[PDB]
PDB file of C-alpha atoms and ligand atoms in Angstrom:
ATOM      1  CA  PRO Y 373      31.680  46.302  41.741  1.00 15.00           C
ATOM      2  CA  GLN Y 374      32.589  46.692  45.415  1.00 14.26           C
ATOM      3  CA  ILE Y 375      29.435  47.665  47.256  1.00 13.15           C
ATOM      4  CA  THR Y 376      29.575  49.632  50.517  1.00 17.64           C
ATOM      5  CA  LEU Y 377      27.190  48.883  53.391  1.00 19.04           C
ATOM      6  CA  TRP Y 378      26.877  52.444  54.658  1.00 15.08           C
ATOM      7  CA  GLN Y 379      23.547  52.251  52.849  1.00 15.43           C
ATOM      8  CA  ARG Y 380      21.365  49.320  51.864  1.00 13.18           C
ATOM      9  CA  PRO Y 381      22.960  47.494  48.930  1.00 12.10           C
ATOM     10  CA  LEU Y 382      20.187  48.030  46.367  1.00 11.65           C
ATOM     11  CA  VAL Y 383      20.511  46.861  42.768  1.00 13.11           C
ATOM     12  CA  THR Y 384      18.360  46.848  39.706  1.00  8.61           C
ATOM     13  CA  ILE Y 385      17.301  43.457  38.443  1.00  9.02           C
ATOM     14  CA  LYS Y 386      15.416  42.281  35.364  1.00 10.62           C
ATOM     15  CA  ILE Y 387      12.933  39.447  35.647  1.00  9.87           C
ATOM     16  CA  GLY Y 388       9.867  38.526  33.631  1.00 11.76           C
ATOM     17  CA  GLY Y 389      10.801  41.341  31.269  1.00 10.33           C
ATOM     18  CA  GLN Y 390      10.353  43.808  34.116  1.00 13.32           C
ATOM     19  CA  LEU Y 391      12.931  45.990  35.895  1.00 13.88           C
ATOM     20  CA  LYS Y 392      12.897  46.039  39.689  1.00 13.13           C
ATOM     21  CA  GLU Y 393      14.925  47.255  42.666  1.00 13.60           C
ATOM     22  CA  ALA Y 394      16.210  44.615  45.030  1.00 15.31           C
ATOM     23  CA  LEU Y 395      18.313  44.315  48.174  1.00 11.80           C
ATOM     24  CA  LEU Y 396      21.447  42.136  48.132  1.00 12.90           C
ATOM     25  CA  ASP Y 397      20.797  40.038  51.255  1.00 12.38           C
ATOM     26  CA  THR Y 398      23.320  37.528  52.674  1.00 10.10           C
ATOM     27  CA  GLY Y 399      20.920  36.712  55.490  1.00  9.42           C
ATOM     28  CA  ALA Y 400      18.355  35.301  53.081  1.00  9.52           C
ATOM     29  CA  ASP Y 401      18.768  31.724  51.909  1.00  8.34           C
ATOM     30  CA  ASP Y 402      16.516  32.337  48.926  1.00  7.77           C
ATOM     31  CA  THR Y 403      15.417  35.256  46.760  1.00  8.61           C
ATOM     32  CA  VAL Y 404      12.009  36.778  47.564  1.00  9.68           C
ATOM     33  CA  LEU Y 405      10.101  39.230  45.373  1.00 11.22           C
ATOM     34  CA  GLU Y 406       6.772  41.069  45.675  1.00 11.26           C
ATOM     35  CA  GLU Y 407       3.709  39.650  43.920  1.00 11.60           C
ATOM     36  CA  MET Y 408       4.334  39.058  40.237  1.00 10.87           C
ATOM     37  CA  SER Y 409       3.550  36.499  37.583  1.00 10.06           C
ATOM     38  CA  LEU Y 410       6.190  33.875  36.723  1.00  8.04           C
ATOM     39  CA  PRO Y 411       6.124  30.930  34.330  1.00  5.73           C
ATOM     40  CA  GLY Y 412       6.094  27.261  35.246  1.00  8.21           C
ATOM     41  CA  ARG Y 413       5.205  25.140  38.242  1.00 11.17           C
ATOM     42  CA  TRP Y 414       5.386  26.409  41.804  1.00 11.22           C
ATOM     43  CA  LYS Y 415       4.757  25.126  45.306  1.00 13.39           C
ATOM     44  CA  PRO Y 416       3.750  26.953  48.486  1.00 12.23           C
ATOM     45  CA  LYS Y 417       6.074  27.543  51.428  1.00  9.48           C
ATOM     46  CA  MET Y 418       6.246  29.793  54.489  1.00 11.88           C
ATOM     47  CA  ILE Y 419       9.166  32.018  55.319  1.00 10.29           C
ATOM     48  CA  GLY Y 420       9.711  34.009  58.440  1.00  9.85           C
ATOM     49  CA  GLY Y 421      11.836  36.138  60.707  1.00 14.14           C
ATOM     50  CA  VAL Y 422      11.307  39.007  63.109  1.00 12.80           C
ATOM     51  CA  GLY Y 423       7.651  39.919  63.102  1.00 14.56           C
ATOM     52  CA  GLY Y 424       6.501  36.652  61.655  1.00 13.59           C
ATOM     53  CA  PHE Y 425       6.025  34.508  58.584  1.00 13.14           C
ATOM     54  CA  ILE Y 426       4.464  35.029  55.178  1.00 12.37           C
ATOM     55  CA  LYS Y 427       3.196  32.585  52.582  1.00  8.86           C
ATOM     56  CA  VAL Y 428       5.046  32.510  49.268  1.00  9.63           C
ATOM     57  CA  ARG Y 429       5.038  30.571  46.020  1.00  8.85           C
ATOM     58  CA  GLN Y 430       8.313  28.911  45.130  1.00  7.04           C
ATOM     59  CA  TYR Y 431       9.268  28.950  41.483  1.00  4.46           C
ATOM     60  CA  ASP Y 432      12.424  27.170  40.388  1.00  2.48           C
ATOM     61  CA  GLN Y 433      14.756  27.581  37.436  1.00  2.00           C
ATOM     62  CA  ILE Y 434      13.882  31.223  36.946  1.00  2.00           C
ATOM     63  CA  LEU Y 435      16.092  33.401  34.833  1.00  2.00           C
ATOM     64  CA  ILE Y 436      17.179  36.729  36.332  1.00  2.00           C
ATOM     65  CA  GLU Y 437      19.563  39.513  35.430  1.00  2.00           C
ATOM     66  CA  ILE Y 438      21.351  41.119  38.416  1.00  2.00           C
ATOM     67  CA  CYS Y 439      23.631  44.059  37.707  1.00  2.02           C
ATOM     68  CA  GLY Y 440      24.085  42.833  34.187  1.00  3.03           C
ATOM     69  CA  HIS Y 441      24.844  39.359  35.504  1.00  4.68           C
ATOM     70  CA  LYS Y 442      22.642  36.525  34.175  1.00  8.51           C
ATOM     71  CA  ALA Y 443      21.690  33.792  36.619  1.00  9.47           C
ATOM     72  CA  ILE Y 444      19.234  30.946  37.102  1.00  9.98           C
ATOM     73  CA  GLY Y 445      17.660  30.000  40.414  1.00  7.31           C
ATOM     74  CA  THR Y 446      14.690  29.762  42.738  1.00  9.31           C
ATOM     75  CA  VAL Y 447      12.466  32.769  43.241  1.00 10.59           C
ATOM     76  CA  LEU Y 448       9.905  33.042  46.050  1.00 10.27           C
ATOM     77  CA  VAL Y 449       6.946  35.308  45.330  1.00  9.84           C
ATOM     78  CA  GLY Y 450       4.668  36.813  47.978  1.00 11.29           C
ATOM     79  CA  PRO Y 451       3.721  39.726  50.187  1.00  9.31           C
ATOM     80  CA  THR Y 452       7.251  40.743  51.116  1.00 12.64           C
ATOM     81  CA  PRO Y 453       7.765  44.349  52.219  1.00 14.49           C
ATOM     82  CA  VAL Y 454      11.039  44.478  50.258  1.00 16.85           C
ATOM     83  CA  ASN Y 455      12.449  42.706  47.194  1.00 16.45           C
ATOM     84  CA  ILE Y 456      15.336  40.456  48.264  1.00 16.83           C
ATOM     85  CA  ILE Y 457      18.186  38.790  46.422  1.00 16.86           C
ATOM     86  CA  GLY Y 458      19.298  35.780  48.469  1.00 15.75           C
ATOM     87  CA  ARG Y 459      22.371  33.561  48.621  1.00 13.16           C
ATOM     88  CA  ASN Y 460      20.856  31.144  46.085  1.00 13.03           C
ATOM     89  CA  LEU Y 461      21.389  33.778  43.383  1.00 12.68           C
ATOM     90  CA  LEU Y 462      24.234  35.791  44.960  1.00 15.23           C
ATOM     91  CA  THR Y 463      26.491  32.773  44.603  1.00 15.86           C
ATOM     92  CA  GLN Y 464      25.779  32.569  40.867  1.00 17.10           C
ATOM     93  CA  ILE Y 465      26.960  36.070  40.250  1.00 17.80           C
ATOM     94  CA  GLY Y 466      30.118  35.416  42.243  1.00 16.33           C
ATOM     95  CA  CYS Y 467      29.179  37.676  45.157  1.00 20.36           C
ATOM     96  CA  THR Y 468      31.266  37.447  48.339  1.00 20.86           C
ATOM     97  CA  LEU Y 469      31.584  39.173  51.718  1.00 22.21           C
ATOM     98  CA  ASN Y 470      35.020  40.787  52.256  1.00 21.42           C
ATOM     99  CA  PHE Y 471      36.719  42.511  55.174  1.00 21.91           C
TER     100      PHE Y 471
ATOM    101  CA  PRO J 383      38.786  37.359  54.935  1.00 24.08           C
ATOM    102  CA  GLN J 384      36.620  36.472  51.974  1.00 23.99           C
ATOM    103  CA  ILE J 385      33.380  34.591  52.638  1.00 24.04           C
ATOM    104  CA  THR J 386      31.453  32.877  49.880  1.00 22.60           C
ATOM    105  CA  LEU J 387      27.706  32.327  50.138  1.00 21.42           C
ATOM    106  CA  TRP J 388      27.079  28.693  49.281  1.00 21.23           C
ATOM    107  CA  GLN J 389      26.303  28.197  52.972  1.00 19.40           C
ATOM    108  CA  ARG J 390      25.062  30.628  55.632  1.00 19.18           C
ATOM    109  CA  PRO J 391      27.822  33.140  56.538  1.00 21.46           C
ATOM    110  CA  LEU J 392      27.832  32.153  60.199  1.00 19.39           C
ATOM    111  CA  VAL J 393      30.760  33.424  62.244  1.00 18.14           C
ATOM    112  CA  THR J 394      31.852  33.512  65.875  1.00 15.44           C
ATOM    113  CA  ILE J 395      31.330  36.723  67.796  1.00 16.24           C
ATOM    114  CA  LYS J 396      32.302  37.684  71.345  1.00 17.47           C
ATOM    115  CA  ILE J 397      30.081  39.882  73.502  1.00 17.23           C
ATOM    116  CA  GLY J 398      29.921  40.207  77.282  1.00 15.41           C
ATOM    117  CA  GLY J 399      32.895  37.797  77.376  1.00 11.10           C
ATOM    118  CA  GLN J 400      30.979  34.942  75.720  1.00  8.75           C
ATOM    119  CA  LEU J 401      31.412  33.359  72.279  1.00  9.80           C
ATOM    120  CA  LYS J 402      28.252  33.139  70.162  1.00  5.33           C
ATOM    121  CA  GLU J 403      27.369  32.096  66.619  1.00  3.47           C
ATOM    122  CA  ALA J 404      25.981  34.902  64.473  1.00  2.64           C
ATOM    123  CA  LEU J 405      24.900  35.484  60.866  1.00  2.00           C
ATOM    124  CA  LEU J 406      26.403  38.218  58.641  1.00  2.00           C
ATOM    125  CA  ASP J 407      23.231  39.707  57.198  1.00  2.00           C
ATOM    126  CA  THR J 408      23.526  42.576  54.708  1.00  2.00           C
ATOM    127  CA  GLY J 409      19.726  42.790  54.528  1.00  2.00           C
ATOM    128  CA  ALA J 410      19.602  43.718  58.218  1.00  2.00           C
ATOM    129  CA  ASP J 411      20.155  47.433  58.858  1.00  2.00           C
ATOM    130  CA  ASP J 412      20.958  46.761  62.500  1.00  2.00           C
ATOM    131  CA  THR J 413      22.501  44.173  64.795  1.00  2.00           C
ATOM    132  CA  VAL J 414      19.984  42.019  66.621  1.00  2.00           C
ATOM    133  CA  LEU J 415      20.923  39.436  69.255  1.00  2.00           C
ATOM    134  CA  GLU J 416      19.026  36.692  71.050  1.00  2.00           C
ATOM    135  CA  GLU J 417      17.854  37.558  74.605  1.00  2.00           C
ATOM    136  CA  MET J 418      20.888  38.215  76.772  1.00  2.00           C
ATOM    137  CA  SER J 419      22.078  40.530  79.502  1.00  2.00           C
ATOM    138  CA  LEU J 420      23.899  43.748  78.527  1.00  2.00           C
ATOM    139  CA  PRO J 421      25.087  46.649  80.693  1.00  2.00           C
ATOM    140  CA  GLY J 422      23.613  50.076  81.024  1.00  2.00           C
ATOM    141  CA  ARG J 423      20.384  51.684  79.935  1.00  2.00           C
ATOM    142  CA  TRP J 424      18.400  50.701  76.870  1.00  2.00           C
ATOM    143  CA  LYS J 425      16.128  52.525  74.435  1.00  2.00           C
ATOM    144  CA  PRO J 426      13.081  51.244  72.513  1.00  2.00           C
ATOM    145  CA  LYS J 427      13.523  50.534  68.822  1.00  2.00           C
ATOM    146  CA  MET J 428      11.152  49.311  66.086  1.00  2.00           C
ATOM    147  CA  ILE J 429      12.558  46.961  63.432  1.00  2.00           C
ATOM    148  CA  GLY J 430      10.732  45.581  60.411  1.00  2.00           C
ATOM    149  CA  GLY J 431      10.976  41.953  59.349  1.00  2.00           C
ATOM    150  CA  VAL J 432       9.281  39.896  56.646  1.00  2.00           C
ATOM    151  CA  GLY J 433       6.218  39.599  58.799  1.00  2.00           C
ATOM    152  CA  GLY J 434       5.899  43.064  60.305  1.00  2.00           C
ATOM    153  CA  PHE J 435       7.488  45.487  62.762  1.00  2.00           C
ATOM    154  CA  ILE J 436       8.443  44.579  66.306  1.00  2.00           C
ATOM    155  CA  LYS J 437       9.837  46.315  69.355  1.00  2.00           C
ATOM    156  CA  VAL J 438      13.306  45.393  70.665  1.00  2.00           C
ATOM    157  CA  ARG J 439      15.802  46.789  73.216  1.00  2.00           C
ATOM    158  CA  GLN J 440      18.558  49.081  71.968  1.00  2.00           C
ATOM    159  CA  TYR J 441      21.899  49.217  73.817  1.00  2.00           C
ATOM    160  CA  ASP J 442      24.536  51.742  72.633  1.00  2.00           C
ATOM    161  CA  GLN J 443      28.364  51.637  72.684  1.00  2.00           C
ATOM    162  CA  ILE J 444      28.606  47.951  73.449  1.00  2.00           C
ATOM    163  CA  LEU J 445      31.894  46.208  72.829  1.00  2.00           C
ATOM    164  CA  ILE J 446      31.617  43.284  70.420  1.00  2.00           C
ATOM    165  CA  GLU J 447      34.101  41.270  68.348  1.00  2.00           C
ATOM    166  CA  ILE J 448      33.232  39.800  64.956  1.00  2.00           C
ATOM    167  CA  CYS J 449      35.607  37.135  63.691  1.00  2.00           C
ATOM    168  CA  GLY J 450      38.134  38.655  66.074  1.00  2.00           C
ATOM    169  CA  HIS J 451      37.691  42.204  64.745  1.00  2.00           C
ATOM    170  CA  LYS J 452      36.927  44.503  67.650  1.00  2.00           C
ATOM    171  CA  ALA J 453      33.988  46.905  67.461  1.00  2.00           C
ATOM    172  CA  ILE J 454      31.884  49.184  69.714  1.00  2.96           C
ATOM    173  CA  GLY J 455      28.415  50.128  68.592  1.00  3.43           C
ATOM    174  CA  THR J 456      24.676  49.673  68.773  1.00  5.05           C
ATOM    175  CA  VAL J 457      23.261  46.229  69.610  1.00  7.28           C
ATOM    176  CA  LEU J 458      19.580  45.313  69.634  1.00  5.22           C
ATOM    177  CA  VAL J 459      18.172  42.511  71.773  1.00  7.71           C
ATOM    178  CA  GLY J 460      14.986  40.702  70.893  1.00  5.51           C
ATOM    179  CA  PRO J 461      13.228  37.659  69.495  1.00  3.54           C
ATOM    180  CA  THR J 462      15.369  37.178  66.419  1.00  2.00           C
ATOM    181  CA  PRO J 463      15.485  33.885  64.511  1.00  2.00           C
ATOM    182  CA  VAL J 464      19.289  33.911  64.955  1.00  2.00           C
ATOM    183  CA  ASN J 465      21.987  36.309  66.191  1.00  2.00           C
ATOM    184  CA  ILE J 466      22.380  38.850  63.370  1.00  2.00           C
ATOM    185  CA  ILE J 467      25.317  41.113  62.515  1.00  2.00           C
ATOM    186  CA  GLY J 468      23.820  43.804  60.311  1.00  2.00           C
ATOM    187  CA  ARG J 469      25.045  46.786  58.319  1.00  2.00           C
ATOM    188  CA  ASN J 470      25.927  49.079  61.240  1.00  2.00           C
ATOM    189  CA  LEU J 471      28.658  46.709  62.476  1.00  2.00           C
ATOM    190  CA  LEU J 472      29.495  45.250  59.076  1.00  2.00           C
ATOM    191  CA  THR J 473      30.303  48.806  57.963  1.00  2.00           C
ATOM    192  CA  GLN J 474      32.409  49.387  61.053  1.00  2.00           C
ATOM    193  CA  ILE J 475      34.591  46.354  60.446  1.00  2.00           C
ATOM    194  CA  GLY J 476      35.062  47.369  56.796  1.00  2.00           C
ATOM    195  CA  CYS J 477      32.878  44.663  55.179  1.00  2.00           C
ATOM    196  CA  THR J 478      31.777  45.016  51.564  1.00  2.00           C
ATOM    197  CA  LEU J 479      29.915  42.920  48.988  1.00  2.00           C
ATOM    198  CA  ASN J 480      32.000  42.117  45.876  1.00  2.00           C
ATOM    199  CA  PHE J 481      31.400  40.578  42.478  1.00  2.00           C
TER     200      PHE J 481
HETATM  201  N1  G4G G 875      16.531  45.958  61.228  1.00  2.00           N
HETATM  202  C1  G4G G 875      17.179  44.799  61.334  1.00  2.00           C
HETATM  203  O1  G4G G 875      18.324  44.742  61.739  1.00  2.00           O
HETATM  204  C2  G4G G 875      16.469  43.526  60.940  1.00  2.00           C
HETATM  205  C3  G4G G 875      15.617  43.523  59.821  1.00  2.00           C
HETATM  206  C4  G4G G 875      15.012  42.292  59.447  1.00  2.00           C
HETATM  207  C5  G4G G 875      15.328  41.101  60.150  1.00  2.00           C
HETATM  208  S1  G4G G 875      14.552  39.583  59.630  1.00  2.00           S
HETATM  209  O2  G4G G 875      14.529  38.783  60.849  1.00  2.00           O
HETATM  210  O3  G4G G 875      13.400  39.992  58.858  1.00  2.00           O
HETATM  211  N2  G4G G 875      15.817  38.982  58.652  1.00  2.00           N
HETATM  212  C6  G4G G 875      16.871  38.100  59.215  1.00  2.00           C
HETATM  213  C7  G4G G 875      16.675  36.604  59.022  1.00  2.00           C
HETATM  214  C8  G4G G 875      15.379  36.080  58.816  1.00  2.00           C
HETATM  215  C9  G4G G 875      15.271  34.667  58.638  1.00  2.00           C
HETATM  216  C10 G4G G 875      16.428  33.844  58.712  1.00  2.00           C
HETATM  217  C11 G4G G 875      17.726  34.385  58.881  1.00  2.00           C
HETATM  218  C12 G4G G 875      17.840  35.788  59.060  1.00  2.00           C
HETATM  219  C13 G4G G 875      15.779  39.493  57.240  1.00  2.00           C
HETATM  220  C14 G4G G 875      17.049  40.337  56.908  1.00  2.00           C
HETATM  221  N3  G4G G 875      17.810  39.559  55.895  1.00  2.00           N
HETATM  222  C15 G4G G 875      17.271  38.171  55.818  1.00  2.00           C
HETATM  223  C16 G4G G 875      15.791  38.293  56.210  1.00  2.00           C
HETATM  224  N4  G4G G 875      14.852  38.654  55.099  1.00  2.00           N
HETATM  225  C17 G4G G 875      15.004  39.714  54.070  1.00  2.00           C
HETATM  226  C18 G4G G 875      14.508  41.065  54.649  1.00  2.00           C
HETATM  227  C19 G4G G 875      13.246  41.117  55.330  1.00  2.00           C
HETATM  228  C20 G4G G 875      12.844  42.387  55.860  1.00  2.00           C
HETATM  229  C21 G4G G 875      13.636  43.562  55.715  1.00  2.00           C
HETATM  230  C22 G4G G 875      14.887  43.517  55.033  1.00  2.00           C
HETATM  231  C23 G4G G 875      15.287  42.254  54.499  1.00  2.00           C
HETATM  232  S2  G4G G 875      13.405  37.756  55.117  1.00  2.00           S
HETATM  233  O4  G4G G 875      12.512  38.309  54.069  1.00  2.00           O
HETATM  234  O5  G4G G 875      12.963  37.782  56.508  1.00  2.00           O
HETATM  235  C24 G4G G 875      13.726  36.119  54.576  1.00  2.00           C
HETATM  236  C25 G4G G 875      13.530  35.057  55.509  1.00  2.00           C
HETATM  237  C26 G4G G 875      13.773  33.710  55.131  1.00  2.00           C
HETATM  238  C27 G4G G 875      14.205  33.421  53.809  1.00  2.00           C
HETATM  239  C28 G4G G 875      14.447  32.029  53.402  1.00  2.00           C
HETATM  240  N5  G4G G 875      13.953  31.026  54.156  1.00  2.00           N
HETATM  241  O6  G4G G 875      15.079  31.816  52.371  1.00  2.00           O
HETATM  242  C29 G4G G 875      14.406  34.483  52.863  1.00  2.00           C
HETATM  243  C30 G4G G 875      14.174  35.834  53.255  1.00  2.00           C
HETATM  244  C31 G4G G 875      16.228  41.112  61.240  1.00  2.00           C
HETATM  245  C32 G4G G 875      16.822  42.346  61.616  1.00  2.00           C
HETATM  246 CL1   CL G 876      26.554  51.306  65.563  1.00  2.00          CL
END
């Protein structure tokens, strides 16, 4: 699809068998989701921007469906105020900026 | 043009006659620039980041160019991790997300 930016570009995603709403975010290097369980190893990291930093757990090689597009990538999990899809997964679904 | 997302979508902008590097950020509702001088009166504005909400300065009807595309709109000034071109100006220059 071609997604307008008059409104936030929100999509439904499927991860861990659960459906969620997430923001397509070209400003974010990596994907960040609210607290949830995920399988496998993880390691802690801090991410930040306006207003500060939060602690997250970095899981790699996680499978995700975005708009009916299957991808594999890193997912950061932590107290984010909004679910974010970052460049690390936007590339995999072939997403580009166009004007 | 068409901008892929394997690296940060950093572009050159022009504002107050100066060239600056800025990030095209579809997760940002607004346009937020590093501390700088702008003409006219400003208004207070709250924005929310990963870490919380903060107060910044809002200037309206400011001329700004993005990759050479001229625009006039709202520009926020505050402690941002990088110059950010957000949805208000991305919309104005006709930018969409595509996959
Ligand atoms: N209202 C506005 O205009 C506004 C909103 C919010 C901001 S922000 O400063 O917060 N900011 C920009 C930013 C932050 C850090 C580096 C480059 C650019 C967010 C917008 N899109 C990317 C950022 N994030 C997603 C997000 C957070 C909050 C609201 C909407 C979207 S995030 O969760 O900070 C994050 C950080 C870092 C990483 C990582 N390291 O991978 C991933 C995710 C600025 C302006
Ligand atoms: Cl505007």
